[PDB]
Amino acid sequence: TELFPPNLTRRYFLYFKPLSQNCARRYRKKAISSKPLSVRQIKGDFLGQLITVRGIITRVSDVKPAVEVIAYTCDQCGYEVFQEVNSRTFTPLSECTSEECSQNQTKGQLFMSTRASKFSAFQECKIQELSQQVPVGHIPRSLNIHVNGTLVRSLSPGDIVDVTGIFLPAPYTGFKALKAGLLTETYLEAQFVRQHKKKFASFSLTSDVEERVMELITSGDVYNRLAKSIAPEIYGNLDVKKALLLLLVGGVDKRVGDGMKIRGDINVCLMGDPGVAKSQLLKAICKISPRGVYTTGKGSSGVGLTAAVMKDPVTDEMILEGGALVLADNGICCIDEFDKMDESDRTAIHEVMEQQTISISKAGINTTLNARTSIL
Amino acid sequence: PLRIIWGTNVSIQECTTNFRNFLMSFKYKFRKILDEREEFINNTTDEELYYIKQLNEMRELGTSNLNLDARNLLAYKQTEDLYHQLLNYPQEVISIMDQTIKDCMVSLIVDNNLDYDLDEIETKFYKVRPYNVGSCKGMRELNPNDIDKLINLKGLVLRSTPVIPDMKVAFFKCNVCDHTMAVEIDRGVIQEPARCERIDCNEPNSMSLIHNRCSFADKQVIKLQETPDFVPDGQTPHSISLCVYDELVDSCRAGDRIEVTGTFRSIPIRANSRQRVLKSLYKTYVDVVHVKKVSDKRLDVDTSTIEQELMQNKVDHNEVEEVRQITDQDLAKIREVAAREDLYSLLARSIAPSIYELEDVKKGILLQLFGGTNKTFTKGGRYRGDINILLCGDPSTSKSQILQYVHKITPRGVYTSGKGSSAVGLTAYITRDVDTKQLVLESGALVLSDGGVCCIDEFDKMSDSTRSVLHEVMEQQTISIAKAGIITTLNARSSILASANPIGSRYNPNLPVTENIDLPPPLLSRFDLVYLVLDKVDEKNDRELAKHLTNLYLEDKPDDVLPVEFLTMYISYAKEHIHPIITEAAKTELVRAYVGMRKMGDDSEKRITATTRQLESMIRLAEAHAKMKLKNVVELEDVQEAVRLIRSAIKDYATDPKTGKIDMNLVQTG
Amino acid sequence: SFDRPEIYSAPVLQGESPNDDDNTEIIKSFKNFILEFRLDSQFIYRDQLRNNILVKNYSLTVNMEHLIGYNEDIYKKLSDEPSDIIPLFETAITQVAKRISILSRAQSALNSLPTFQLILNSNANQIPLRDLDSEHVSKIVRLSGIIISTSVLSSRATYLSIMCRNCRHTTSITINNFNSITGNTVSLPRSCLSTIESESSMANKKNCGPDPYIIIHESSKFIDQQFLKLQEIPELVPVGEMPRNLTMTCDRYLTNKVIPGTRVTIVGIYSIYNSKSGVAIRTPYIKILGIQSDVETS
Amino acid sequence: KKVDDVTGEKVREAFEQFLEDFSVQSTDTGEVEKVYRAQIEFMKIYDLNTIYIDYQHLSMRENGALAMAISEQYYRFLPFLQKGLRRVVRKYAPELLNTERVFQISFFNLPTVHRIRDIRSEKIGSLLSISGTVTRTSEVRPELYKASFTCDMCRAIVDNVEQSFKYTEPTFCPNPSCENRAFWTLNVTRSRFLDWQKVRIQENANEIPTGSMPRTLDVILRGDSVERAKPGDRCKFTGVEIVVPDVTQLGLPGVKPSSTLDTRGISKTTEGLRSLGVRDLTYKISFLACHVISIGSNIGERDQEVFLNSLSSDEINELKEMVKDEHIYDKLVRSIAPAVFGHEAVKKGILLQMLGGVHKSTVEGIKLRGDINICVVGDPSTSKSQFLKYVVGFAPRSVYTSGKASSAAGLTAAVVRDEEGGDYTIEAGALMLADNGICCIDEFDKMDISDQVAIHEAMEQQTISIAKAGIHATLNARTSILAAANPVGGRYNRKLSLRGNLNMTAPIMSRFDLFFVILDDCNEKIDTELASHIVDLHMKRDEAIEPPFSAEQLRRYIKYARTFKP
Ligand SMILES: Nc1ncnc2c1ncn2[C@@H]1O[C@H](COP(=O)(O)OP(=O)(O)OP(O)(O)=S)[C@@H](O)[C@H]1O
Ligand SMILES: Nc1ncnc2c1ncn2[C@@H]1O[C@H](COP(=O)(O)OP(=O)(O)OP(O)(O)=S)[C@@H](O)[C@H]1O
Ligand SMILES: Nc1ncnc2c1ncn2[C@@H]1O[C@H](COP(=O)(O)OP(=O)(O)OP(O)(O)=S)[C@@H](O)[C@H]1O
Ligand SMILES: [Mg+2]
Ligand SMILES: [Mg+2]
Ligand SMILES: [Mg+2]
Ligand SMILES: [Zn+2]
Ligand SMILES: [Zn+2]
Ligand SMILES: [Zn+2]
Ligand SMILES: [Zn+2]
């Protein structure tokens, strides 16, 4: 008899969490999977292995249904025919291939059914080499990450992450003349993600968090202790650091039943003589905050602040790609050299600072977009 | 035992019985007690049979579409499972529901022995349109397991394709014997006959399809810009394709905000035109079942802009409502509220309850929402009662909040910012469509906001070239484009509400009004109302304002004001049914006021002299004030109120006519 | 560097109603005839199939007049067009035998089971050799005569594993039809099948050439084919005429069952071949389905 | 034998009976005359290929069933209409048949005209009327009507094979030599062709919905209807809604219909040595117009003898009555823009602009411009835009453009890429659409300097040069220019000169014949009557306007006066 195979009756996704370095130290085990590699160090001899890469996420595609096996129904025999798909393209089955139509002289016609076919939630992400990982005089390199199943939407642009996955080859993309032999593209099929900075929305009152919170409370003097420990290599500036801590926390977001909104985010300007280490304070805050984006007055242009309409080729559609303010959404935008900015960026932050939106009406686009940044 | 469609949990017989019992036995009091609304239960609306009444009126008007609120299914006890089956399996459940509607249609006339003929009912095809199927989840938050499920999306329509013929029956003719057959499409596939079916003629490859003899159905693709309730971290707005079919084609225009409910579909896309190889990554879209264009929170569309569209809606029999229905009791309430002596103050006070005072600004905003009467000449001329308002002010004057409220309250306006917009992005442009790789025409912000209010924040910061676009919009309510793609005249009947700051970012009493506003006279003359919103520091005013802002944060969720639903429907009724005309007593005092302010302009730029557009603005504001009080004539007191609002908006009483300066203490009352 | 996608099916719905001319229904009717036929009180064909599997004789001997007693329509189909119906009954025998070849050896304490051979005997009217006609072409004929020559056994391929010359694509061909004479009705493919299949994702203009496949003989399987010559009996021959004869082909268990000089009845298909005397003339021959020795020499 | 269409046969008999039996009573006398026999005997004189049939006349027949059957299934019943017309012509005028002459039936005067957005899929194959603005027109081209082929191995000639839209080849081959049906070749010389033109039309301005962009439609003209459509005018097309294959819809969402060949009655063998062909069913709606009529672009031929013959005698009497008036000039200058109060000099200039001057050429070849260019400058709200809006509404072949919304290619002519296909096209700009007319450019100061360069190239040269990509062309730009400008700073400065107030280029300023500076001066009396006039307009709509001449008779007088060459 013919059964539905176990691939067609599985409701679960299976992932491999890497063994920790600390647990590997106990048993004198040397873990290749635990050690975070840079993008440069992932060579061809790591293919097929479970490896961990640390880096900043630059681009994340939208979640799309990638078909793993296609289901067809035949009216002639009543069978359901399934064809697996493991490539970017497939040829659909036209004429029926069950055992009943194969022996019969009249073969049935297959009609594909979406609901009986199996799909995976699919995302393609780019991870970039971190600045400390890049050697001297080099440009950071990038790696493709394939995200399937439950792990989708766990990667966002701008996150510094440890992505553990299986390093796998892909069919060659590029000009045919340039290829020499059995050249392959590479990607990382993601298995596990650990965030270097934990998001505030992802916070949950787990048991282990509670004792640390109670310890910090029972130590007492929490406000001054947290403020003075923000940038401790900077001497003094206690009130500045207190306002920076209030910047990190912020007030409550106010919603009126009429729909009118009053922002809970605090905006802080630090203006002073050169050499007061306020750039150091911005970098300290802006590494502390999980969604902190550091910008320069003229290094960040207008299109690098708001948005740009660009084509995404993996999902094959034109999408809006955010600037620095979108990257710092529900975070802190870290604007150094504030007086050096041009007037267009000043209008952009002028709309951002109160309405928490950016309204763009150009030839490319007619949108409003959420920019809920607290601005330092 | 129990027969179940493969891949579902749906039994056809059980679903038919449950839905028929729901149709026969549902009352709206079940919906009220579901929503925990016990005090709002009344007898004459609830205890009557609801869907029986709609079936009766649907037979009487001859319509074929039934609008089903899916929340009502969850209200009824027996159809609680049917709600989840409709969400999970709309393709089978909707067909079952259509069959049940047809059965109830024939049963209502057989049982009551009505004079309606059974044959006319039987030939009709009845279909139900479910809506309010759940929360408007983000479209990008949907997973592949949500394919072929019913979903809700809020969105803004950017553009739509022309009507596409989708083949349903294919017509084949034999080349040798002229024998014709018609084959009906099966799941997107038409089987060509290899040989002629006639006993006399059996020539292979002799059946040729005739493209114009065969029948087609209407299919339209609309690009919708989603506006979800919840937006995650760092998400940019995205546009989704939605497909409408048959009567729903061309129901949605560009620039309107709609509630779409439909099934979440995915298809594979051919990688090449010549090849049959498909791409493994699927393309997602929504097959639209129902469109809602009416919100109780905001106003409805101005019907003078869609008269031909309403006629074509009646021709197409789409049975989609652009306007909310006005019942007799709420119309009586509208007539009773219009009889109040404090109607102007009550309506202006109920505009923005969160915004404290700004009474004259709120009065001007309310008159802009009402608008003047629209006059179309039989010769061909057109006069529009669109009121343009400028709010020039100091920082912290709630004018951004006012533009936000107006943007929320209008049916189809657009909110833009200074230096966030360009001249091309305001009028119209050419883009490349992702699906077709074609050059497609797309409306700019001003054309999208036609029939509504275009709000422009930071108007003073906008460039000269971009502000020079607004001249034709403000005076003729249209834009005359002569570019490579289009040479045409586009209607932009959008009232403009602009917000601005002075040059020094704060009002300087040393400089005159014109220097503080810093607008060219051609642009500033086109504004009907110019508001100088000033910050005067007082004990009582600052105390009251501080108390007003601090009462907001007493609780987590915060005189007498009208509710926003009643406000919107009252303004809607007044715009739809009141078209006031100018009388002799209004005409003479309009002329006297215009002559008087021209005489005031004789004195020695420093001051904004009176202009003919100010006479036009007096006419429009008087018509708006007459339309507010439901009066069909403009008489003297409405014109005096228009003149008073014009004087008080720019604070003409506070300023010195000779110098043009404004002194803060000697007249001003905050 | 990915593997093949897999195509597989599972029965879900009832489908269209079965048709008598469909191959599956004919196979099912043949299977029911094998399982349920009673001669006097015993299932003779089922027990015969079990005994043949025990002796490792992969063939079934079926009396044709029993098919009269069981079901007329499939007898008519077998008589009118045997070339399409005989593979179906052989498939039915092979399908029943698989149930016997699993449920027996695993209980009375890898194995590959070939397609069984249909041997069928008839007691009906015997056509004389010179009364054969064009109306008998491609139909089962029962006829009598004397065998004057038996050839040596030739080796035909049933299963052969082939490999592309330079491409090294590996393929297998299974042959269950050996009825043809002077013809390779099944042969090696004219071009490599790796490109049209597109089984691998990499797919590393490359053309392997005409006839690129090579037979791997150590993994190929073969059977025996024999040529016989049947002559009309010399007792009834016209005086001035040379006696007329026919070339016949037998395979597998039908070979080496008769010596020259034996008078036989033969059930077989009156068939056609072209030998390279008339623009369109074909030489007749018989594909032997059953041999009956009228008398047995000692 | 072929099977016939019985409903088509009844349609043929009813239509051929209609071609004789229909009659009307004479207006002048009351004689019973039958208009379509008169039509056929008139075409027999002048060798016309086209018969014009009124739709109301066909609708009068029977109870209206014939008109409904013809309109609903026009594509199906059209060959029956052709056969009926051929038989009726054979009965009366057999000489028309000989040169075989291809006959075309043009229907007109349909009861309703449909908008370009009212086009739906249920009307495909039906007679219908649409209206639209012609934006692009193509070269007259030959279309393969009746092809001639030779079989490749027979090599005998066959002819008169009908073509059903896309190119077809015969599979019959009545020559007994071959046994192959598919293989043929086509010769272009012996083939018979028809005239073909594709004209692109656009939604009219008043027909456009509230926020939508205008959408276009490609309508095909054949036979005598070719070249009756011109870019920039409003045309009413009567014809059949057809459907055209479209490969564009490949990436669109939704299930696209496909067409497989059915394999149920084919006997097969697995002898060995499984490919089948499937074709896409993706289409777009087009129009095939049998009749073209050009509605006036306005809301409401150089020789005067040609012009007076078109007018009836009663209207010629009214024209000569207007000519006979001694105060005709005062009536004309008061009839220009009655919504505007005052400004008699601007009305004089606008009237002279509409009349224009004569175009003269020297022996050297230098052309003297007869067009008069007017520029109106002044203080804000001096009714400058009212003049331009009146001119574009009243004057024929007139376009209204804004300075900011215009572009250099949008004003003169643009080379356009279509569907990313290798062909390039030219679409006429604003000055070409207003050729021998007036181009109204509002907000002239706001226009870009490069656009000013691109327009005064046409202002001296009276022509537009195209050298972009592979298209080189010289186009006519014989247009008058009515411009409205605002001075620098908004208000007109009395202290400065005209060049100081205007930001426009000096080559722009030199070509303007008249500069009308309208100043705003606040006087009590003039403001009083102006305010009274404006409020009376708002109060009384059309009847507050009292011109000496209506728009139609003013336009008739201007069209008469343009024929004179002083
Ligand atoms: N209070 C402080 N404590 C510790 N280091 C300090 C302090 N003030 C200045 N510095 C050091 O002095 C240098 C000043 O660097 P910056 O952070 O660039 O100062 P700055 O305020 O940004 O000056 P700019 O960029 O010219 S406005 C750094 O090396 C700081 O570490
Ligand atoms: N009169 C007022 N009534 C109520 N709330 C007020 C008032 N004035 C200020 N606020 C509050 O203060 C905030 C200041 O924002 P806005 O007044 O909207 O800024 P603005 O008036 O647009 O001036 P800008 O941004 O400098 S042009 C508002 O969001 C309110 O919460
Ligand atoms: N003399 C006039 N007669 C009639 N209406 C007038 C007159 N002067 C001004 N108006 C009206 O005042 C308004 C001015 O509109 P426009 O014609 O656009 O002014 P304009 O002269 O074009 O000045 P700009 O450059 O547009 S600011 C319109 O409503 C006119 O109908
Ligand atoms: Mg610094
Ligand atoms: Mg603001
Ligand atoms: Mg103007
Ligand atoms: Zn099948
Ligand atoms: Zn036929
Ligand atoms: Zn090979
Ligand atoms: Zn031939």
Residue numbers in the entry:
A (entry chain G): 189 to 564
B (entry chain D): 176 to 733, 739 to 784, 788 to 853
C (entry chain 5): 2 to 110, 129 to 223, 233 to 304, 319 to 340
D (entry chain F): 101 to 199, 260 to 433, 441 to 467, 498 to 763
Paper quotes:
The Dbf4-dependent kinase Cdc7 (DDK) regulates DNA replication initiation by phosphorylation of the MCM double hexamer (MCM-DH) to promote helicase activation. At early G1 phase, when the DDK (Dbf4-dependent Cdc7 kinase) and S-CDK (S-cyclin dependent kinase) kinase activities are low, the origin recognition complex (ORC) together with Cdc6 and Cdt1 load the Mcm2-7 helicases onto origin DNA to form an inactive MCM double hexamer (DH) encircling dsDNA to license replication. During this process, DDK and S-CDK, act in concert with various origin-firing factors to convert the DH into two active Cdc45-Mcm2-7-GINS (CMG) helicases which then serve as scaffolds for the assembly of bidirectional replisomes. Compelling evidence in budding yeast has also shown that the essential role of DDK in DNA replication is to relieve an inhibitory effect imposed on replication initiation from the N-terminal serine/threonine-rich domain (NSD) of Mcm4 (residues 74-174), as NSD deletion can bypass DDK function.
